[PDB]
Curated annotation (Swiss-Prot), chains C, H:
One of its GO terms (molecular function) is ADP binding. Belongs to the ATPase alpha/beta chains family. It comes from the Eukaryota. Changing G52D: In ATP1-2; growth-defect. Keywords: ATP synthesis, ATP-binding, CF(1), Hydrogen ion transport, Ion transport, Membrane, Mitochondrion, Mitochondrion inner membrane, Nucleotide-binding, Phosphoprotein, Transit peptide, Transport. This is ATP synthase subunit alpha, mitochondrial. The chain holds residues 240 to 544 of 545 of the full protein. Present with 41500 molecules/cell in log phase SD medium. The keyword Glycoprotein does not apply.
Swiss-Prot record, chain E:
Present with 28100 molecules/cell in log phase SD medium. Keywords: ATP synthesis, CF(1), Hydrogen ion transport, Ion transport, Membrane, Mitochondrion, Mitochondrion inner membrane, Transit peptide, Transport. NCBIfam families: ATPsyn_F1gamma. Signal peptide: none annotated. Changing I259T: In ATP3-1; dominant suppressor of the slow-growth phenotype of yme1 strains lacking mitochondrial DNA. GO terms for molecular function: proton-transporting ATP synthase activity, rotational mechanism. Changing T253A: In ATP3-5; dominant suppressor of the slow-growth phenotype of yme1 strains lacking mitochondrial DNA. This is ATP synthase subunit gamma, mitochondrial. Changing S163I: In strain: D273-10B/A1. Its main location: mitochondrion. The keyword GTP-binding does not apply. InterPro entries: ATP_synth_F1_ATPase_gsu, ATP_synth_F1_gsu, ATP_synth_F1_gsu_CS. GO terms for cellular component: mitochondrial inner membrane; mitochondrion; proton-transporting ATP synthase complex.
From Swiss-Prot, chain F:
This is ATP synthase subunit epsilon, mitochondrial. The lineage of its organism: Eukaryota, Fungi, Dikarya, Ascomycota, Saccharomycotina. It comes from Saccharomyces cerevisiae (strain ATCC 204508 / S288c). Belongs to the eukaryotic ATPase epsilon family. Keywords: ATP synthesis, CF(1), Hydrogen ion transport, Ion transport, Membrane, Mitochondrion, Mitochondrion inner membrane, Phosphoprotein, Transport. SUPFAM superfamilies: Epsilon subunit of mitochondrial F1F0-ATP synthase. F-type ATPases have 2 components, CF(1) - the catalytic core - and CF(0) - the membrane proton channel. CF(1) has five subunits: alpha(3), beta(3), gamma(1), delta(1), epsilon(1). CF(0) has three main subunits: a, b and c. The keyword Transport applies. Transmembrane segments: none annotated.
From Swiss-Prot, chain G:
The lineage of its organism: Eukaryota, Fungi, Dikarya, Ascomycota, Saccharomycotina. Mitochondrial membrane ATP synthase (F(1)F(0) ATP synthase or Complex V) produces ATP from ADP in the presence of a proton gradient across the membrane which is generated by electron transport complexes of the respiratory chain. F-type ATPases consist of two structural domains, F(1) - containing the extramembraneous catalytic core, and F(0) - containing the membrane proton channel, linked together by a central stalk and a peripheral stalk. During catalysis, ATP synthesis in the catalytic domain of F(1) is coupled via a rotary mechanism of the central stalk subunits to proton translocation. It comes from the Eukaryota. Present with 164000 molecules/cell in log phase SD medium. This is ATP synthase subunit beta, mitochondrial. Belongs to the ATPase alpha/beta chains family. It is found in: Mitochondrion; Mitochondrion inner membrane. F-type ATPases have 2 components, CF(1) - the catalytic core - and CF(0) - the membrane proton channel. CF(1) has five subunits: alpha(3), beta(3), gamma(1), delta(1), epsilon(1). CF(0) has three main subunits: a, b and c.
Length: 116, 120, 303, 101, 265, 48, 120, 303, 116
């Protein structure tokens, strides 16, 4: 928090917490249905499911192999992008939209693309 | 065509005469009877289909001759033979209950049941 | 075809099969059967690769299939253990990483200066139980570029060859592909790694959007299937893949996908093999070829 | 998926707050005299009601409050190292005072 | 160890599998009774509906809802919870009476004004006229049920025995009964208490039917759910079994290496 | 008293001569406590 | 068998009992010979020895031996190295089942577990 | 009885128990106690076996109970490792199989030519954590012809003897069963099998088929409890099981099973020690004996 | 049932079965909960919890590792006191009023203490 700042550290804390919860409920998710998850938790799980997909960013050397054009997202942009997701702003659009895309703005545009 | 039914089981849900005890006194339904709604009071009910007669003891409900000549009788529970002394002892206890007292209404209902039982 | 650790009988059937398909005239078989001694088995791939290098150093393109290096591992293990070298992980000797790397890295497509030679090496590793954390398999994966993982459950469920796309990669494979089969097949790999994702939560709730993809995906899976020992023409593969990619397999009921393929190919040949010759020689689909095919695919789909 | 009864959720609610109470950032030691109050508050369930998010805020602020008024109290905890009746009462009153505000 | 931690987990999955199997069988047993009841209940209701149809009655608004008091029912609780919220966009002020803990919690979170009456202990047992009646009586006393010129009740209609669809129906009101187009084809007294009685009588009779439908959907849904549970648990058994088997071999190998090393020395 | 409450009490009494089934008796014995819910809040869970 | 096949032209069928015990026996002889025991104890020469046994068994142009072997998968595990080596040699599997015998089916051969790589 | 590794105090208790039960009038106790030297421990079953040969050879019969060969194994391990002989699995000697196999085949019911004799044997193996996969158990399991698998859970659950009869198997088994007892025990095997399957349904809302099974099964399980160190005469084993087979014990509540047993036996002696003697001497049940027995049981069951 | 006699044995045998039942049922309670589990079984479970904590009694040498002084409860008295529990003669006593105290007299005293 003294390196990348309190805000970055705070952002990271939440990312870790959400993902740790998400890993924790992997058992329950398999044994029962995902609807049988507690409703409060189900929100966390949905957020984490989004976070998981969001984290995949196309790479430029991978751009050849994947075929998906690479994305280099600024560090300043990254903090904002995850921050927004943590505030659930753009949590309202599909997991497929979050999958293999760059910045938060790119997700929004991709939502429009997906909507078509 | 009689439809006599309880939530517990259907009873007749053809039947020639049905004799019913209603807040309008006693009503007997025979063939075409003009279509009515009747509150069934705690009751002794007789159903005759042909001359064969089956006797039902009925806990009150609602009765409705439908305008298609379908006698819908609906009541909470019932045969007369199944209902048919220990209850008279209980009813005595129920008289005791009136002394203290919803309990008042209950004990009053127990007296109604005592009459209904006495009819048997 | 390098046969290591295989029965002399089994190989004799293979040889006869090759002579049935009269393939002997383009193929060599080097043999190191189970009967053949373990040191011979250890030296069996290395020797085979020398023969291959002569072809490669004739500047000619070739292929060598080393089936199976897993039996080479057991052989080197046996030899090593009998040489009393201290066991490594999984009792496979400590120089096993070197053993496989020494074998594998001798094959490659030479620089144009050094000729046009290529030795295509596809080594066939026999995983017992699909153990993809296992030492012998993992070492090979790390050495090679691609993987072609084959799933037994799917194999049983009539996907022959069963291609578990989740565990199949090919690092530089896509830039070797002919442009016709790059265009027509473009992004289908991504699409069926959406079929995989979609069907993950299909078996939770479902939505019509996912379902539309699932209907496409399942139907595409039907399209993938092949009947063993029946090869296809490259030209013929272009339309089938065109059809499916362009979503003409919502247009064909899932059951009739197999029927569609055979009939479609027959239709194309009878209707106009001119198109197929064009995509065959051009090796790309121009706007005209693309349209002619669009038209042709619509034409067959309708009938 | 066990639907907890309220009695178990009294424990659960109390328990959660304790967990938040324990946390400390790296390279941030504390004075024991001012760890005794924080535990008093928690154990005497004064934090149970307090919203989960602002427990950290409560902790920071409570310490500031104890520094402000009950700095006499802290000195005593340093001096005597066992809570006396007077200290327990003082501490109880102080803790109560800070539950709201 | 690896081996032991695998093994204890594999045993856990096995025990879970056994329980999900057991539950699924027991669910089938319970289901037979549930369905049997639902037939009788539905027949009983139909006679009252016969009046309402011929009457053409036509229904603040009240919402009553029915679900299980306890989980492992399937998605009955939350499919209804979602559909209540939907019809709470169709009325932004209605008083929700929740018959069932599972529906109670979910709606209670979303609007903490609307929950006015709630029950608890219904769902454990199969529906009984006594329970329905007392709730109806309490609906009249506490909530003054007749006052609301709209009432709608929610339950889960068990559409097919592999499905449950959250469902609602409109409970007719006593003001309505009076002025319903037909109410005159039917004949009864001018000293009739027939609105004040018939409303009340069908308040319970309709409510019991709704409970019977709901309970049947609960038991049906759990049977489906517990079957699917058994399949998912089985997959986990297979996965930990392979892990167990590999790990067992590995332990032998690791021990052997120590032995070889010793022998070499 | 409510008309249908009146009928209910009568039905419960009427299962009393006796020969009756357990299921009848279960149908005539309540097993609930109604939780009145204030506006969030909730007056006591009076035995229904 | 080979005298029969090769020098009397016979078609023969050679049963072996547990080939688990063939493997097990070989493993011991190695350990006695002082050879470093390999994975899951098994002899370093496991594959080759089985190979000799199961390549001697063959169809000659004189006769043919055919061999039925009995495979008791040790520890009930089919993931052990000894089963793996065995399965490599196997061409068919006959999976007798007592469940099947309990359905009164004699032969006791399990229909859906009997699979052969000779079916084509 | 071959007391292997059994502490001298333990064997002293054994001796005392045997004397108490007046059994040293046929017993021999070969003792290699815990402190006794590892060669003595190693050779202890071999030594014991030789004593058995004298009886067997004379055409006499005998039963040699090796308890426990698991500790014998440990002694061979000690010897081999100390003699620097090549080690093997689980640090147990490589020829440990050979040792045990040599020992366990000595037991035998001799040929008619060499006169009918026997040397019944009952090796005892100690499961280190229920590990049937463990090297010394696996080997022994293979060598043996039958197993009795005693489970600790059953012991805790008050079933004493704590035999898990599911995992008990007998090779020769019912071929050398008392003929009478065989007749009245086909049902018993099937009943217990059902009871096992329907076990998990006992955690409930019971189906009629299942609850019937449960009643029969629970009473049987209680019946098969036997207080330790009390053997029961075969002519009295046969009646008790007959009652259970005829389902008359079903009525008897679980607590009254115990009382029923002894009472039934006393009733059988008073009413029909003719039946008991007939069972003993005829040895084979007849329709008349079974008829009479059922009647007697009914009368007793009433009381 | 000879060494310490039939009575001692019988009391302990009932205890062993009771505790084993509680452990076996723990899994059922975990998923199924109190539902398709018998009322009789539930009373046995309740007794087992009482017994479990009736076995809890302090140690005198854990007045420093606890603070409650241990109880040297006479063997005969213990057999009797445990016998009472099994009969359910003290099923009106809180589970925690069996916890970390001596004999039956003490258990009753802690019941009273807790009652206040």
């Amino acid at each position: 928090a003294a390196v990348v700042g309190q805000e970055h550290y705070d952002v990271a804390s939440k990312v870790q917490e959400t993902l740790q919860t998400y890993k924790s409920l992997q058992d329950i998710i398999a044994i029962l249905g995902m609807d049988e998850l507690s409703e409060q938790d189900k929100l966390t799980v949905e957020r984490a499911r989004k976070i998981q997909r969001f984290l995949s960013q196309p790479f430029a050397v991978a751009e050849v192999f994947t075929g998906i054009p690479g994305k280099l997202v600024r560090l300043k942009d990254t903090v904002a992008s995850f921050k927004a997701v943590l505030e659930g702003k753009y949590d309202n659009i599909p997991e497929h939209a979050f999958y293999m895309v760059g910045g938060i703005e790119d997700v929004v545009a991709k939502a429009e693309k997906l909507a078509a | 065509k009689l439809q006599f039914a309880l939530p517990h089981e259907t009873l007749y849900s053809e039947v020639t005469q049905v004799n019913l005890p209603a807040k309008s006194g006693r009503i007997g339904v025979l063939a075409n009877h003009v279509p009515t709604v009747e509150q069934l009071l705690p009751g002794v009910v007789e159903v005759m289909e042909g001359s064969n007669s089956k006797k039902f003891f009925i806990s009150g409900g609602f009765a409705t001759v439908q305008p298609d000549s379908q006698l819908c009788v609906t009541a909470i529970e019932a045969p007369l033979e199944s209902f048919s002394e220990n209850i008279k002892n209980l009813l005595a206890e129920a008289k005791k209950n009136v002394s203290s007292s919803r309990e008042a209404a209950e004990a009053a209902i127990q007296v109604e049941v005592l009459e209904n039982l006495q009819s048997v | 075809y390098v046969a290591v650790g295989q029965k002399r009988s089994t190989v004799a059937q293979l040889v006869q099969t090759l002579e049935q398909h009269d393939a002997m005239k383009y193929s060599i078989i080097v043999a190191a059967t189970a009967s053949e001694a373990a040191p011979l088995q250890y030296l069996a791939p290395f020797t085979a690769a020398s023969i291959g290098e002569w072809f490669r150093d004739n500047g000619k393109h070739a292929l060598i299939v080393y089936d199976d290096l897993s039996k080479q591992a057991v052989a080197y293990r046996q030899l090593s253990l009998l040489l009393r070298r201290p066991p490594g992980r999984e009792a496979y000797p400590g120089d096993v990483f070197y053993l496989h790397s020494r074998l594998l890295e001798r094959a490659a497509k030479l620089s144009e200066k050094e000729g046009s030679g290529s030795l295509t090496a596809l080594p066939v590793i026999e995983t017992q139980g699909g153990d993809v954390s296992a030492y012998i398999p993992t070492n090979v994966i790390s050495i090679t570029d691609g993987q072609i993982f084959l799933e037994a459950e799917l194999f049983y469920k009539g996907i022959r060859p069963a291609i578990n796309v989740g565990l199949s990669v090919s690092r530089v494979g896509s830039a070797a592909q002919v442009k016709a089969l790059k265009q027509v097949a473009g992004s289908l790999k991504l699409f069926l790694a959406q079929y995989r994702e979609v069907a993950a939560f299909a078996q939770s709730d479902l939505d019509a959007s996912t379902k539309q993809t699932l209907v496409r995906g399942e139907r595409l899976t039907q399209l993938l299937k092949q009947n063993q020992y029946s090869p296809l023409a490259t030209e013929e593969q272009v339309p089938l893949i065109y059809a499916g990619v362009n979503g003409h397999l919502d247009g064909i009921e899932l059951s009739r996908i197999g029927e569609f393929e055979s009939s479609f190919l027959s239709y194309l040949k009878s209707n106009h093999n001119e198109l197929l010759t064009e995509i065959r020689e051009k090796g790309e689909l121009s706007k005209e070829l693309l349209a002619s095919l669009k038209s042709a695919t619509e034409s067959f789909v309708a009938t | 998926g066990s639907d907890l009864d309220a009695s178990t959720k009294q424990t659960l609610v109390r328990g959660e707050r304790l967990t938040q109470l324990l946390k400390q950032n790296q390279y941030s030691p504390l004075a024991t005299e001012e760890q005794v109050p924080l535990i008093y508050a928690g154990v005497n369930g004064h934090l149970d009601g307090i919203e989960l998010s602002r427990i950290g805020e409560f902790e920071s602020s409570f310490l500031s409050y104890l520094k402000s008024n009950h700095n006499e109290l802290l000195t005593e905890i340093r001096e005597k190292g066992e809570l006396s009746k007077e200290l327990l009462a003082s501490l109880k009153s102080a803790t109560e005072s800070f539950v709201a505000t | 160890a690896t081996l032991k931690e695998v093994e204890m987990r594999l045993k856990s999955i096995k025990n879970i599998e056994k329980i999900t199997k057991t539950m699924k069988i027991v669910a089938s047993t319970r289901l037979s009774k549930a369905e049997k009841a639902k037939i009788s209940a539905k027949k009983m209701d139909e006679a009252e509906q016969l009046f309402y149809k011929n009457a053409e009655t036509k229904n603040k608004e009240l919402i009553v809802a029915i679900t299980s008091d306890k989980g492992l029912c399937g998605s009955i609780h939350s499919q209804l919870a979602k559909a209540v919220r939907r019809h709470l966009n169709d009325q932004p002020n209605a008083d929700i009476v929740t018959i069932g803990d599972k529906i109670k919690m979910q709606l209670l979170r979303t609007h903490p004004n609307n929950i006015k009456l709630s029950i608890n202990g219904i769902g454990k047992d199969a529906p009984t006229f006594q329970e329905s009646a007392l709730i109806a009586d309490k609906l009249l006393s506490v909530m003054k049920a007749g006052t609301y010129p709209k009432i709608s009740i929610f339950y889960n209609d068990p559409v097919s025995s592999l499905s449950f669809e959250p469902s609602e129906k409109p409970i007719f009101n006593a003001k309505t009964i009076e002025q319903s187009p037909s109410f005159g084809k039917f004949e009864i007294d001018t000293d009739a208490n027939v609105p004040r009685d018939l409303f009340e009588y069908t308040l319970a009779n309709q409510m019991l039917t709704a409970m019977a439908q709901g309970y049947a959907a609960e038991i049906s849904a759990r049977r489906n759910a517990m079957d699917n549970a058994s399949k998912n648990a089985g997959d986990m058994i297979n996965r930990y079994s392979i892990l167990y088997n590999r790990t067992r071999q590995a332990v032998i190998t690791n021990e052997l290496v120590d032995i070889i090393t010793g022998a070499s020395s | 008293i409510s008309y249908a409450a009146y009928l209910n009490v009568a039905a419960q009494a009427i299962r009393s001569t006796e020969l009756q089934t357990a299921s009848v008796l279960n149908r005539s014995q309540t097993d609930a406590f109604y939780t009145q819910y204030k506006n969030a809040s909730e007056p006591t869970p009076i035995t229904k | 068998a080979e005298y029969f096949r090769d020098e009397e032209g016979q078609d023969v069928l050679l049963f072996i009992d547990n080939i688990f015990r063939f493997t097990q026996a070989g493993s011991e002889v190695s350990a006695l010979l002082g050879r470093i025991p390999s994975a899951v104890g098994y002899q370093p020469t496991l594959a080759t020895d089985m190979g000799l046994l199961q390549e001697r068994i063959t169809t000659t142009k004189k006769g043919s031996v055919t061999s039925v072997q009995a495979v008791y998968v040790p520890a009930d595990d089919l993931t052990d190295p000894a089963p793996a080596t065995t399965f490599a040699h196997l061409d068919a599997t006959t999976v007798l089942s007592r469940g099947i015998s309990e359905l009164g089916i004699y032969p006791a051969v399990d229909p859906l577990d009997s699979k052969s790589r000779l079916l084509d």
